[model samples]
Every structure is written in structure tokens, then in C-alpha cells.
Target chain A: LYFQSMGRTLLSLGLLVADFGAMVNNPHLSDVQFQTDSGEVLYAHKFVLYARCPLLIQYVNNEGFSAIEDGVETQRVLLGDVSTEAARTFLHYLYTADTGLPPGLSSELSSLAHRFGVSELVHLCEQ
Target chain B: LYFQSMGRTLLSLGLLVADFGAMVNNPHLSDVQFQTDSGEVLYAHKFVLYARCPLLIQYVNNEGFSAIEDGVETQRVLLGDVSTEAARTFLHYLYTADTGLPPGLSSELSSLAHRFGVSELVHLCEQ
Candidate 1:
């Protein structure tokens, strides 16, 4: 899996925190620095990763999903048969906002359908 | 009087570490920071003050000092009759090098006469 590949990459760098699934499906944060082995101070940066699992797993399970609009104009993209392009689009939106799913699923079903997207739906249980 | 003024200035700022003689005669250092009353982090800087009191006080005590060169080539500028321009020049040299005095009083006195400059002579006793 892509998560497994990410874990292996981090391990090679001597980083023990290698939970790629959490990184992709939930809000995961890490601090990064580059320095010599002698304990010298170096450059530093921070990373915040967001991911959603249920929708991603469902989309992987099937590939014919179509989007539905509710009464409230919420976009509800079905996980059962979502296209790769649709999944990628959802992921992009989540990354920018750092928030869970979009607004209601559709304008017509404002009360029933809810806005669902990659970031809004999944969260790391461990925070 | 200048030292008294300096002390007053520091007192106004709530800084009690004021010893003008020591500041002008030795090495003194202080860290500076600007912040709001609420303890928010602002900007920070450091200051290193160097001074030599004995020579300065001597110069102040005498106004007609003339410098003498020694056998070792050390140039000794007499504190009693130094020119204002020469005094300013000496001060500039000291500020940059952060040392107690210049080389031998003159090039002629490598052994007996010692180089004497503002920074090379005076040092803050407190360190």
C-alpha cells in the first residue's frame, strides 16, 4: 500500500513514527529538521497531514460512483462508485481547508444528504 | 555625572545593573528584548559594553598629556595632554576591538612602554 511505502521511507531516515494511514486519513503532525550526526542545529520545518479512510476505501472498492445534490445544495459524492478524478478533487479540497467534508450533500436534500469530503470525514483516533 | 545620568536612565527602564565605571573599564554584557506588557514575544538583541576606567579617569584628570615612545617601540599617549581628536580616535578603536588597550605605548618600547588605547586600558570590574 502507499502507506506501507511511506512507512519504509521514514524508517530509512531513522524516523520511528511511520503511520502513513493515519497521515493520509486523519490530521497528523510532525516536526522535521536536518543536521549533522554530531548534534548541530539545522534547518527546521513543520508538516500537517490530513486524510480520510472510509470514503477512500469505499471508492477503491468500486468505481462507478456519481455525485448527488441535495435540497440545500450540498454535494454528496457516493463512495460506492466514485471516479478517481472525483476522489482526487475531494482530497484537494480537504487539504486546503484542513476541515472535514464539504457542506450538505446537495441542495435538494438539505435535511437528509450532508456534504461529505475526504478531510471532513476521517480523523485520527489518537489526535 | 555621565555615569549618574546612565544610572538614571537604567532606573527609568527598571534595570538596576548600572555601574558606568565598570561598564567603561571592563567587559559587560546584557540581553535586550522588546515586548508588550502582556508578555507576548517580540524582538531580542544582545549588547556587549567595554570600558577602561583608569585611563579614562586619568585623561579626564589631566588635559595636556603628551604621548611618549619607549625603547620597545610602544607608543604611550599621555592621558594628561591628549588632543580631543586623538581621544575620539582612541575611543573608536576600543569600541571595535573590545580589548583593554592598544599595543605597546609606542613601537619603541616592546618591553617597558605598553600600547595604550581606550579599550585596551579600561575594563569593567564586574566582568
Candidate 2:
């Protein structure tokens, strides 16, 4: 019966909402940088995250980041004390709005989101 | 094997994208009024359509929709010569971004979308 279904996909729109490490791959208009756990660099687009999570906007703008390296104003936000992998998943959920939340990491991510004021992420995790 | 699939859903965001006669049902913030064929009325949310289809904004703001009934200027866009069902499906697509282009209606919708400037609808139909 499902095979008889139509309108299952929206290529351009749906592609933007996929599971796992999506930010690592498609940064369509990604500009912001998150300095993850040692040596790990993660990047994201502002409008995408800001539209869903307001906290990202604040974190992205905070002064702790933007060290004038060689006098070059940095775009990266150093998110210390958090694993790059976890934040990678966080970034993925922000883009897709579909955490496609894994069972193993659901509790972990939920805790992380709660700490970070991502209400949607908390609800998404609970769902 | 497909049963092994995890992350099959995104509760928070996916609920916003549903199928068939959805506009007739769930209109979270539906504000625009579309007067379909034969005085039939269909309504939609502005941000939803404007984000997906640029043409809708123009149609919504075409000035003729505001009819002074009683004492208030009503927001009704008179869409002449088009069936309410077709346009209902169109509104559903704008909301879900998935036209659910049925086989029987594919060609009909393709031409309709072209006439109305819904590129994704025609592309969705062709798919």
C-alpha cells in the first residue's frame, strides 16, 4: 500500500534534512566555525542553526572566540570541555531538524542539549 | 532488514511535514485566505508558502483579496477557474514541500504548476 504512495521526497528540501555528520559534508552556506576537542574543526551556517536554536547565535557571537591569530579575526568558536563527536551530532541535528537520534547517544545528547539551552533538542531527544 | 533501520523519524520537525488534505486539517498559523473555484475558500500560512514558492506572496498580496464584508476588509484571494481540490493539494505542497504527485494527476499538475510558476511541483511530478 505504501508503494502506491506519492510525494515521498523533496530532493532539495529533504536533502537538507538528513541523519548523522551532515554538517561535515554539506555546508551549503556554512560560515561559522566551532573549534571542537583538540585539533577538530567543525563549521556551520548561521541562519540554519539560528532559525532552530537561539543559543547558537549567542555562542557564535560571544567574545571568548575570535582570537586575532596573525591579526586575522577568527570565525571559530572554541567549545571546550565537549567532545567534537557529540557536538558534530548536535550540529547535524540543527541542520536536519532530525537528530535521527541514536539509542546509545540519546541520553548523552539530551544531557548536552539541556546544558546548552536547546529546548527543541531536548524535545527532539525525548521524542 | 529494513526493520533494522534506526533514526527512521524526526518527531519535532517531521510532524510539520505531513500528507494529503493537510491544509484542510492542520493550519498552525494559517492567515491567508484563498478563494478557490465557485466561491470555495482555502486558507494558508504565509511564511510556509513564501519560503517555498515566491509566486504565492504576490498572489496573496494582489489587493483584490481584501473584500470589505460587514465592517472588516477580508483577506480572500479570488483564484478563478481552478478547482479547490487542486489548489488544496497545492497548499498542502507548499506546507509539506511534498506534492504527493499522484500518477493520474502527474501530467495535469505539471502543466498547472508551470502555468502558476511552481517549478518544484512540475519537477516533483516529473519525478
Candidate 3:
């Protein structure tokens, strides 16, 4: 509707983080899919993935994305060696940028971040 | 294709911030609109806004969002009191959580953030 005169509310970093964090694995408005070894799937937006990990984009560039019959351009990344838990964590980080790694996931996530060129996550994991 | 063996890449806060930051004002995959006094509209995703400012969501809840004849739930917020530049910064903060207030905008943006119940932004503005 309309917000005028005194005006409408806006944003803060903490609330912004909280907002994007809720989007992790949310199916609504998602445009990409990450399938782990267990056949579990995680949904995402390409813009998010493209921005968060350019290396992943490199992989996408190396191997072109697949399309459904309708030509919706939804890309799929199959993580055959990655567990669902780890993959979820990876997707969560991509969506929220949170590095509070789950117990026992630091090393795995760090290497995962390394392969994707996320130097910051690697640095965090190392510490 | 597939990422196996050694594995695929993941995320870090810096890159994640960059990614979502890029999404700000990007038309791709956007689902909501905020129109300023100049009628210059900014695009956004509902998930991001829904997460960032609950106060805005309260407005959405109170006033009810308008939809097209086809039943697409694209909401519109008419900011008759807001400038395009100010709205962009507000939306940018929602997307990236970056509080690097643009020059001459701390007071304006802070008030904007405050009306929406963004306490942290109000605090930032105070600083």
C-alpha cells in the first residue's frame, strides 16, 4: 500500500542477517538445486550462489547448467561425495554467510570453502 | 555435472555479503517493488524484506498486499515520502547488512530504519 508523511521503516544489519538467514534451504522463489549423496536436495537462487562463490560459478562455467523441458534454467549440482549434513551447512553458509560451523564440520567445510575459493571460510576454519 | 572426490566449494561472510549485496536492486529473480516519490521503483525479494524488517512486514500484514489479476502475489510499497536514492540505500542494507551509511544519509536512513523498527539501524544512526 502506501507509507508516507512520517515515513516507513527500513533496515539494520542484524535484522538483514536474520532475514537472509531464514532463506537458507527455503524452497520459495528458489532457482537452483544442490543434490547431496543421499539424494537429499537443497534449493537456492543462482544470484546468491554466483555471488557467494565465484569458484562454484567457474564449475558452472566449466560444465554448463542443465535445463528442464520447460527451459526454466534451473541448474543442478550433484555432490556425490558430500553428506547431506555437510551440504546443508555449505548451503546455509552461502545463504547466511554464517561460519559458526557445526561440531566436526570445520575441517570438511574449510576444504569445501577452499575448493570454492571462499578464502574467508578457510581462514575461519583454520582458526 | 557432479562434484565428488575432493569436493565442491562453499561460503564465507565476506563473499556472502558481496553476493547478496549484488542482489540489491537487481531485477533478476525479484518479486517485490518499492516505489519512491519520483516513481522510480526498486525491485526486491519478499524473503529478504520479510527477514530484514518485521515492521515492514507488519505493514504488509496490516494493509494487505495487492496482487495482479493472474494471482501473482507481487506486493507494492508506495514510498511517497522517500527518495529513490534513500530507498536504494535502505534496500541495500536489507540485502547486505552493510551499515556504511552514504554521505548525508545517516539521519535520513536512520529515521527510515527506525520507523520500520530496525533498532540496530537507529543505533547506527545515533552513532
Candidate 4:
């Protein structure tokens, strides 16, 4: 899968972080796990999410993260609004920044992009 | 300098992880700090080192990382053996996998690469 062209894309800082997340593959670093309607699992890297979406950074790191589960506070995020694949693609952009979106997927890309407050994906979907 | 040629270079997964390390620059995640002979600072990711160099992964993650600073434990790393530029090149290899090599640095590169247990960089030095 690593054609010469692909090597350069991997070098990009955005994709690199995403690639690293997958390589490290340790669940300890991933705080929020997104379960789609189908029960398919996805996760957001705290730092990558923080870098891509400022509003979401709190989910990865401290202060705000601890606030969510004080043993007193409770939180649950459900993805009933978006399909499993769309949510996956949205989360994927959080890492690689851009990727090949097979046909049928582009329709939901913009909506998810807008919802997640991601400008780059939003623009990719817009075009 | 992202020529279309370079575009392809970046998409590889190895480069991707290294790229991500630079993005998550917060020192909080970085456990050990490497000071070259010249006093230049290079931080290693806990996970990446674990992934790349199996023997050295402990420096990035726990169990071993904490072994160093237990209120009683102590640690000190100095790169007096490798020149500043050679050490820099080694650390850069840890991130981007491969990069341009400035002249007059290859001799030290192989030794430092061996010391780090980084075979890819070592092979690059070998060639």
C-alpha cells in the first residue's frame, strides 16, 4: 500500500500523528471510544483530537477529562445521529487529515465535518 | 517544498507516526528528554520508541520510565560519543524514518544508530 507517493503523505505532520496512533494502538491513550449504532468501535486520540478540534481536546488530556468522570460526574456520547461509516470517516480525518472516500461516503462527510467543527474536512467535503 | 513527488513520500505509514510525534509536542506525554553533547534537547515519544526499538520502549511508557524517578531513583544520559549533528540526525530518523543527510555526518551516524538499536537508520548508515 506504500507507493512512493504514499510515503510523502505519511510524512505530513497531520497524517503522521494519525499513523502513530494506530501504531501505538494502546487503548490507554484513547479516552473516548465511539460506538456507532452498529456497535462498531472507534476512538479519538486525545492529543490529535485536541490539535484538530480545540473544543474536543479536553477529551484527550487533563483538567476537562477528569471533570467528566469524577466518580461523581457522568457522561455518555451516542452516535444515533450519524451512520457508522460516516462517524468512522470523521474520526479518520482526525488522524490522516484526508483520505480516499469511496462513493456513498461523501454525502455524509460534509455533515459530519460541520458537526465536528473540522475546517479541513469541511472544505474537503465542500469541494 | 512539497513537490508532487514529495506528496507521495509523505503518505507512507512510517513517516506518518514520526510526523504525529512532532505534532503532539506537549512535553507532558514525552517522558525522557535527550540532551545531545551540544546541550540540544531531543524528546522521545514513549510509544514510538516502544514500537520501533523493542528493547528501548520502556523509556517511553511506564513500568520502566517510573523506575528512574521514584523519589530515590536517578537517571542521566549524555551523547558525548556522537557529535551534535549526528545525534540530531539519529533523533530525526526516529521521527521521519528517513531524511536528507548533511555531509560529514555519516561516520558517527552508524555508531550512534547501532547504540540506539535503530536498524533502519543503521542500514541507512551502512549504505
lDDT of 1 by residue, A1-127 (tens): 2333443443443222232222332322322222223433221112321133343334333532223223222112233333333333344333333233344322212211233333233332112
lDDT of 1 by residue, B1-127 (tens): 2333444444433322222223322322312212223433121112321133343334333432222223222112233233333333344333333233344332222111133433323332112
lDDT, candidate 3, B1-127, per-residue tens: 2332112232344555677888888766566777778978787776676667778766755664564524555677676677788889988877776766776888778778878987776666676
Interface RMSD of each: 27.1, 7.9, 5.8, 5.5
lDDT (0 to 1) per candidate: 0.30, 0.58, 0.69, 0.53
Off by over 4 Å in 1: A1-127, B1-51, B64-89, B96-127
Top lDDT model:
3
Itemize residue pairs with steric clashes in candidate 3: A9-B116, A19-B51
Model 4 C-alpha lDDT versus the unseen true structure:
0.53
* Candidate closer to the true structure by lDDT (higher is better), 1 or 2: 2
lDDT of 3 by residue, A58-78 (tens): 675566467562555567767
lDDT per residue as tens, model 2, B8-81: 34454563343212444233324567776678776565444444555666667774355654454546677766
Highest-scoring model, TM-score: 3
List the candidates ranked by lDDT, beginning with the highest.
3, 2, 4, 1
Model 4, DockQ value?
0.20
How many clashes would you count in candidate 2? 1
Report per-candidate DockQ: 0.01, 0.10, 0.29, 0.20
**Candidate 2 chain A lDDT trough over 10 residues, lowest sum:** A16-25
* Number of the predicted model whose DockQ against the real structure is largest: 3
Candidate 2 lDDT over residue span A78-126, tens digit each: 7767777777787766555564676667776887698667776776567
